[PDB]
Design a protein around this ligand. Structure first.
Ligand code: R4Z
Length: 500
């Protein structure tokens, strides 16, 4: 069982349950399968064949998930085009990917029309809500692909065959890569037992992590809630109405949800809700601000397209007082380049092996034993939790020993008088580097400098101690490199500078 057959099995055994819903629409598992079958028939009637690449370019809608599944059913290689791409970058990917067809919605197509319609290898262009005067040549209305009943034609799909290309470099997934990537993602979707759960991903469904989440949720029998851009702009209001059991988002997504409660009397109840902050870093500081706002125990996921899917999962960030990213998922193997130290660079190999990189003309094959160098520094505890020591380019050297800003910042944020902090170093003639702490005092809370110093005496080794404190009422926009370059400016704008 491949990804489409897994969906079809659950769809046919739980046919009347809701598979996908929006605020004002819903489709059952069975009716979703019927839509998928119609699209497949339309694709094959348009002479789309196995191995043909199809660029997909649309916002969150039921047709997007059905189109993925229709591509999987007939073996058409789907190529999702991020909504963040300009018209210029969209056309480049259509050309680079050697796509011969394109499926998009009205908003994205009309932003991109000449570019799309000037890619001459595109035999078919299907647009949801295509305007009638634009039905001509190879541009078709989406209705034409579903106008014909399912023809019950068979499909021979094999696990080694290409399934999709996800551009960061076009990362090629086989059917097996997707099976294994969804299997990793399934382990990270753990809604609480309802006293039926709906899954929400705030990342666009065109983006690989949401694709995997959606497959994984449907295969577990959950419904998937799809939100529009305006729905997410009004996320607190949307959440109060839709009440999903599980929410994936960026750290920025959840920071926004926290901010909205400050100014919205009627509190949103996320206490039963399981929330997963997804990224390539650590969510420890977010998790604890997230707990005293909502009483919810934030989780995190760590992965990237080159590793197939999520590879490291923290099912309870707030339970670990040090910054940490969690535990390798099943089959995930790690290596820490920590020669002669306890801390080192995290190297990962994933059980979801991507096939290679599409370079326009050939697939650059990956030796399936290759490790990925993350650029992140870790230490592995006895229980195999990965303590997160930050971004390797951010480490500081003090008397030869490495110092990790993320670690100092996590200690600093524990103080109630500190709203936020950023630690970085500046050059120093005879010490090499000097540690600076940029401290943001909590509003109203009166400042107070040696308190920080004495606090840090009690909690970090001396060599990690900042040599200097810059008190600033707002920290600029975070890149410790840029702030280090602005060190003299920061001091001149500072409300106070304390030098030890
Ligand atoms: C599909 C590969 C993948 C991509 C991304 C991303 O945010 O780009 C993420 C993860 C996996 C993840 O586990 C949390 C964030």
């Amino acid at each position: 069982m491949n990804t489409f057959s897994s969906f079809r099995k659950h769809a046919l055994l739980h046919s009347k349950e809701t598979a996908v819903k929006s605020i004002n629409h819903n489709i059952s598992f069975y009716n979703l399968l019927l839509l998928i079958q119609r699209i497949a028939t339309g694709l094959k009637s348009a002479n789309i064949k196995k191995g043909d690449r199809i660029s997909i370019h649309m916002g969150n809608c039921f047709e997007l998930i059905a189109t993925y599944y229709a591509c999987l059913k007939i073996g058409a290689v789907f190529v999702p085009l991020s909504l963040k791409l300009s018209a210029k970058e969209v056309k480049n990917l259509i050309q680079h990917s050697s796509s011969c067809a394109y499926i998009g919605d009205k908003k994205r197509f009309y932003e991109t029309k000449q570019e799309i319609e000037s890619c001459t290898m595109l035999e078919k262009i299907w647009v949801i809500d295509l305007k009638i005067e634009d039905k001509e040549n190879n541009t078709h209305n989406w209705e034409e692909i579903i106008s014909q009943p399912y023809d019950y034609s068979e499909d021979n799909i094999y696990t080694d065959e290409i399934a999709s290309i996800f551009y960061t470099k076009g990362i090629v997934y086989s059917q097996k890569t997707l099976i294994d990537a969804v299997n990793l993602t399934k382990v990270t979707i753990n809604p609480r037992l309802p006293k039926k759960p709906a899954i929400l991903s705030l990342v666009d469904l065109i983006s690989p992590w949401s694709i995997l989440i959606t497959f994984a949720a449907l295969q577990k029998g959950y419904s998937v809630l799809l939100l529009s851009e305006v729905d997410i702009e009004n996320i607190t209001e949307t959440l109060k109405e839709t009440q999903p059991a599980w929410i994936a988002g960026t750290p920025s997504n959840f920071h926004k949800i926290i901010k909205n409660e400050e100014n919205n009397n009627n509190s949103l109840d996320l206490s039963e809700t399981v929330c997963v902050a997804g990224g390539d870093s650590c969510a420890t500081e977010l998790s604890q601000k997230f707990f005293e706002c909502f009483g919810s125990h934030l989780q995190s996921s760590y992965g990237q397209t080159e590793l197939g899917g999520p590879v490291i999962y923290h099912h309870d960030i707030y339970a670990i007082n040090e910054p940490s990213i969690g535990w390798p998922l099943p089959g995930v193997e790690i290596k820490i380049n920590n020669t002669q130290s306890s801390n080192g660079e995290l190297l990962i190999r994933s059980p979801a092996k991507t096939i290679g990189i599409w370079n326009g003309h050939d697939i650059e094959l990956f030796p399936s034993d290759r490790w990925l160098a993350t650029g992140d520094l870790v230490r592995q505890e006895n229980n195999r939790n990965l303590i997160f020591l930050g971004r390797e380019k951010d480490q500081i050297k003090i008397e030869g020993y490495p110092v990790y800003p993320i670690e100092i910042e996590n200690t600093l944020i524990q103080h109630a008088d500190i709203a936020a902090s950023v630690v970085f170093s500046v050059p120093d003639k005879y010490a090499g580097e000097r540690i600076i702490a940029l401290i943001q005092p909590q509003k109203n809370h009166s400042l107070k400098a040696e308190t920080i110093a004495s606090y840090l005496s009690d909690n970090l080794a001396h060599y990690k101690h900042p040599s200097e404190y810059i008190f600033i009422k707002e920290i600029p926009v975070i890149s410790r490199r840029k702030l280090s370059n602005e060190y003299h400016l920061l001091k001149s704008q500072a409300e106070k500078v304390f030098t030890l």
